[PDB]
């Protein structure tokens, strides 16, 4: 029955950018004009919907008393919050709030959080914190880091611990066990559900809140579809109900996100169009028309100057650019143009409180780029400047002193500072995962344009969006409820299917078809067959669409068993999970990447070949080496310490030297090259951990030493020959380079006094601190008691003694170690095991009993390496020596069953 | 060995299997933009309407003043996108009568009359725009205005300087009779037989 599909035919190659609509119909007073090289499309400020005659902003004194403590500072509620306080607090329905961005969607999430918090009230006390958990899935990580602060302020009176899922998997399961509001990205929560670190607390998860669920349209869409198909499938199997609250932007196919979330379209579905936006924004779209890109860049700079000067003295402007260098570049560019046309004094009139606060805040400033602009109205805000200086920009812009803030996108996620005018300059970000300059996402544009209009002062937002003209219709469909939310799951369908195979959620192709029916792809394939490669002939011949789900499951499973992720027989349709499958699911690496690591990982790989096997990952299949950076790459290739076998105009050499230039902390210069480096290292964490797990599972001891060291070198951003005191980030780097200059072994520092250390480094001031940090460094003392069980097996009882002072600020709740027992050649791991040294049980011996095999050429030793899973140069090797080992005799063979004729009882 | 030669590159597209002939054509359009034969060969190589549409969109972005590329890109679209693209075709190829005639076929009467008016303003020396105006007039509800067009036709075409053929005009009447507008062919054949007594 099964027919193999063309799985890359059916995908949408634009990704987050695909327009399902052909037409984009605008509001009424929404003219367009071809000015000079650009077409300007105005869309006026939508008048808000006149209030229903029996609908009012209820105060917080009408919502129930357990929820009144969360709304501090709030007298009334929003209109959107007043429309569904009854569906978020009185009803346990799954919700889909499709509101405009900035229209108070996080207080709706707080209402659902207060309903689930208000089921544990504990009459004399306040909150029974440990019977429930609430997941808040927000798309960007800085949005998560500010939602942690917001929900930590609002739920402070309940004692509810809000935290962000970060760190390694042990840190994440400890943070899940410790906290109630778990704010995370979809990818972090999905990698926890794949690795399994929430399995003990999924009966405690009673509410997941999917902030910005129009990320279903993004290339990060399959993560959210996998998360919600997994949660809805566990609701239909395990029958413990979780409440799903999808917050969205007002975009089409919202009824399909409602059917996707199991939202009943009567009780749970709430669609507020852009009239319900609180500060109604007049949105301008400059689509630059001409076809020579340097004239397009000059026209873009002329347009940001003209639209700055349109709101010169009247309003604040928040310009949004793509790069951190571009922030200061176009701040100084519009400042040089305002100084050129003598319009610089329009921002700062002699409002001497304002310009004097700006002048004395400029002269206090440490940022020499921000000090150039702050005497005038201008300022910059990227994530690269200081926390003090960027919160200086935040507080100087919230007090209407900074007339023009220029920023990257991260401010739009990280801070709720809204301006009157926002001006998104360019819409072109260099995405290294595509390896090219692609358009800004739906998420980033909707969040940048939620900052238009501040809810206190402004009666009307103003959002200018300077684009290419061919990309004008995308953003017109996006910001005017006309860009449909379409599933991108066919891009990542074998990876999500492998995650369901690894978790055991699907076993045969029928359960995989059942799981695919819970995805957003199934509802979008049902509602729009033509867009997803289905004819209406096929929907009339398959109305529930089961043969297309069998074809998708069969095609994804052929991609899985071709890449050796799943043992898939076409006879019965059953899946068997491979350990490569577990590693690819646990570390999110694609099926082509584990096929690369299955072909390329040999036991005999050096450190040279390991960077090459890493660099041939299919995560970097779009990384190309451009010629404009090749010169800089040569200046890296003569300085990186691991040699590269490739030539530098091959991309694998670029990924190789970018990883090595990251670990070496070489300062890079090209923006494309720094972006490719940041991408390959944020992938290199999981990719090197997946190589380490493949290599550890197959038992290769030299390569697992190399790969675990390279995991810790990518994570700690230092080479392992550097001092281990760089993993304590609290030291001065000058005394650490004085330690590396005086190159003795690091284990020499243990035997010295705090005087003796300080005079060996010639730093007697630093000596006590170096002693404290060398005794904070993890150091296990191993002792072995080996007992020959048979001739073939020994029982090793390894006592692990922590010889380091535990400190919660450097070690945390636990220190993870690997116990690797390997032969004389140290090339076969005979026994590896994970060892959690928990913080309750430091300073006492751990008995780890295991059994190692012993083979007929009786080895002189085994080696027990107890290495840290996280810390560089934290390794204790212990030679289990077999010199005086008297093995037992090879035991006599058992007595055979002589085939006696069977004994009757008369015998 | 011979870059900047369109016929060698077309031979190279024609002798490969099509999927590596796509890379051959990509080499050719790196070597030779503004080259419409390579782009129509790129269109014929891909065997799906979406990819042919994208390739001819890139082709029209490269060289926009070629009537063959507009003919190749219009034949893939369905009539509303086809007339939207044909309006830009006759805006970019204003001296090509075939795009004007296909557009006036592709539009409503109050728009087709403006389009044929603009085609006669750009291209006065054509006789197919006049017979297409007759076919448009008879094709919709009017019927007596048709002879008023043709008598206005052969006037201005004798005022510009093209003689009437007695072969091409009766061929226009014959293809009109094969196109179901016999009353326009009647008056056209009357004038053509009149201007070409017992002999």
């Amino acid at each position: 029955p099964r027919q193999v599909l063309d799985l890359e035919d059916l995908v949408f190659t634009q990704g987050s950018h695909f327009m399902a609509n052909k037409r984009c119909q605008l509001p009424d007073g929404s003219f367009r004009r071809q000015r000079k090289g650009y077409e300007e499309v105005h869309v006026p400020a939508l008048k808000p919907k006149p209030f229903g005659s029996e609908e009012q902003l209820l105060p917080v004194e009408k919502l129930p008393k357990y929820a009144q403590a969360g709304f501090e500072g709030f007298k009334t509620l929003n209109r959107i919050q007043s429309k569904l306080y009854r569906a978020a607090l009185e009803t346990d329905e799954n919700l889909l709030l499709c509101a405009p961005t900035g229209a108070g969607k996080t207080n709706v999430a707080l209402m659902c959080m207060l309903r689930e918090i208000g089921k544990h009230i504990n009459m004399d006390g306040t909150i029974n914190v440990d019977d429930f958990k609430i997941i808040y899935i927000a798309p960007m990580r800085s949005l998560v880091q500010e939602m942690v602060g917001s929900f930590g302020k609002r739920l402070a009176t309940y004692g509810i611990t809000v935290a962000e899922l970060t760190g390694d998997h042990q840190l994440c399961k400890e943070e899940i066990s410790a906290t109630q509001i778990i704010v995370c990205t979809p990818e972090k929560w999905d990698i926890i559900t794949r690795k399994g670190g929430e399995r003990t607390y999924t009966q405690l998860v009673r509410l997941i809140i999917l902030d910005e669920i129009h990320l279903l349209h993004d290339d990060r869409g399959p993560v959210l579809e996998a998360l919600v198909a997994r949660a809805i499938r566990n609701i239909e199997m395990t029958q413990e109900d979780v409440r799903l609250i999808g917050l969205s932007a007002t975009l089409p196919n919202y009824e399909d996100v409602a059917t996707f979330l199991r939202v009943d379209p009567a009780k749970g579905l709430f669609y507020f169009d852009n009239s319900f936006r609180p500060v109604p924004l007049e949105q301008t779209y400059v689509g630059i028309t001409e076809k020579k890109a340097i004239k397009r860049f000059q026209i873009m700079n002329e347009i940001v100057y003209e639209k700055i000067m349109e709101h010169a003295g009247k309003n604040q402007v928040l310009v949004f650019v793509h790069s951190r260098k571009e922030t200061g570049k176009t701040a100084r560019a519009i400042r040089d143009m305002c100084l050129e046309k003598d319009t610089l004094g329009l921002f700062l009139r002699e409002g001497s409180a304002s310009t004097e606060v700006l002048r004395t805040e400029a002269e206090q400033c440490k940022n020499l780029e921000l000090k150039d602009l702050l005497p005038y109205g201008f300022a910059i805000h990227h994530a690269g400047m200081t926390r003090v200086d960027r919160t200086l920009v935040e507080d100087l812009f919230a007090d209407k002193h900074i007339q023009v803030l220029v920023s990257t996108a991260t401010l739009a996620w990280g801070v709720n500072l809204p301006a009157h005018t926002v001006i998104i300059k360019g819409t072109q970000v260099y995405s290294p995962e595509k390896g090219r300059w692609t358009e800004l996402g739906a998420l980033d544009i909707l969040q940048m344009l939620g900052r238009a209009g501040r809810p206190q002062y402004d009666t009307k937002g103003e959002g200018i969006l300077i684009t290419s003209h061919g990309e004008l219709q995308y953003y017109l469909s996006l910001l005017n409820q006309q860009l449909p939310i379409e599933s991108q799951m066919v891009s990542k369908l074998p990876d999500m299917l492998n995650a369901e195979i690894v978790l055991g959620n699907v076993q045969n192709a029928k359960d995989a078809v059942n799981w695919l029916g819970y995805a957003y792809l199934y509802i979008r394939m049902l509602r729009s067959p033509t867009l997803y490669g289905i004819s209406h002939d096929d929907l009339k011949g398959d109305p529930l669409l089961d043969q297309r789900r069998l074809d998708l499951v069969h095609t994804a499973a052929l991609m899985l068993d071709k890449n050796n992720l799943v043992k898939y027989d076409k006879k019965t349709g059953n899946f068997q999970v491979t350990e490569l499958g577990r590693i690819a699911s646990h570390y999110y690496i694609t099926n082509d990447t584990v096929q690369t690591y299955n072909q390329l990982l040999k036991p005999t790989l050096s450190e040279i070949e390991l960077f090459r096997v890493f660099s041939l990952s299919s995560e970097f299949k779009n990384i190309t080496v451009r010629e404009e950076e090749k010169l800089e790459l040569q200046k890296l290739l003569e300085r990186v310490p691991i040699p590269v076998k490739e030539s530098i105009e091959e991309p694998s050499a670029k990924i190789n030297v970018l990883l090595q230039a990251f670990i070496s902390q070489l300062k890079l210069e090209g923006f494309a090259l720094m972006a490719d480096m940041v991408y390959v290292t944020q992938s290199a964490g999981r990719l090197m951990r997946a190589i380490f797990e493949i290599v550890l599972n197959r038992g290769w001891a030299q390569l697992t030493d190399k790969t675990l060291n390279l995991c810790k070198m990518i994570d700690k951003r230092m080479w392992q020959s550097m001092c281990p005191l760089r993993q304590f980030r609290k030291l001065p780097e000058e005394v650490v380079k004085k330690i590396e200059k005086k190159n003795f072994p690091f284990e020499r520092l243990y035997d010295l006094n705090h005087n003796e250390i300080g005079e060996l480094i010639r730093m007697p001031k630093m000596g006590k601190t170096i002693h404290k940090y060398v005794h904070l460094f993890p150091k296990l003392e191993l002792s072995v008691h080996l007992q020959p069980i048979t001739r073939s097996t020994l029982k090793v009882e390894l006592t692990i003694t922590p010889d380091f002072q535990w400190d919660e600020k450097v070690h945390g709740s636990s220190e993870a170690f690997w116990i690797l027992v390997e032969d004389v050649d140290s090339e076969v791991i005979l026994h590896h095991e994970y060892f959690l040294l928990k913080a309750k049980y430091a300073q006492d011996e751990h008995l780890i009993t295991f059994f190692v095999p012993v083979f007929e050429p009786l080895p002189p030793q085994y080696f027990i390496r107890v290495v840290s899973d996280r810390w560089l140069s934290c390794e204790t090797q212990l030679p289990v020596s077999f010199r005086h080992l008297i093995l037992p005799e090879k035991y006599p063979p058992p007595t055979e069953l002589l085939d006696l004729q069977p004994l009757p009882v008369s015998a | 060995m011979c870059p900047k030669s369109e016929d060698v590159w077309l031979e190279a597209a024609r002798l490969q299997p099509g999927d590596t002939a796509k890379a051959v054509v990509a080499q050719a359009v790196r070597h030779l933009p503004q080259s419409v034969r390579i782009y129509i060969r790129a269109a014929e190589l891909e065997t799906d309407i979406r990819a042919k549409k994208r390739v001819l969109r890139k082709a029209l972005e490269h060289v926009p003043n070629s009537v063959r590329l507009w003919k190749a890109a219009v034949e893939l679209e369905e009539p509303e996108d086809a007339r939207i693209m044909l309006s830009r075709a006759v805006e970019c190829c204003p001296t090509s009568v075939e795009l004007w005639l296909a557009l006036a076929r592709l539009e409503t009467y109050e728009n087709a009359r403006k389009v044929l008016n603009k085609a006669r303003e750009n291209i006065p020396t054509d006789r197919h725009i006049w017979i297409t105006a007759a076919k448009l007039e008879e094709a919709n509800g009017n019927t007596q205005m048709v002879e008023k067009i043709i008598d206005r036709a052969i006037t201005s075409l004798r005022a510009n300087g093209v003689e009437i053929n007695r072969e091409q005009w009766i061929q226009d009447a014959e293809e009109c009779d094969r196109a179901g507008s016999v009353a326009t062919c009647q008056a056209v054949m009357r004038a053509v037989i009149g201007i070409g007594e017992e002999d």
């Binding site: 327009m19 052909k22 037409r23 984009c24 119909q25 605008l26 509001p27 009424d28 929404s30 003219f31 367009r32 071809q34 077409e39 499309v41 028309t289 003209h469 061919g470 004008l472 219709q473 017109l476 469909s477 | 969109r57 029209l60 972005e61 926009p64 679209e77 996108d81 939207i84 693209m85 309006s87 830009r88 006759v90 805006e91 970019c92 204003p94 557009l103 539009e107 728009n111 403006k114 389009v115 603009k118």
Partner: peptide, 26 residues
């Protein structure tokens, strides 16, 4: 009302564009 269209905007960004005010029907 202003209706944006994929084919219409692609054909708008082609060409010369003083020439978009030709062949009326615009």
């Amino acid at each position: 009302a202003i209706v944006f269209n994929a084919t219409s905007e692609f054909c708008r960004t082609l060409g010369e564009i003083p020439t978009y005010g030709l062949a009326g029907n615009r």
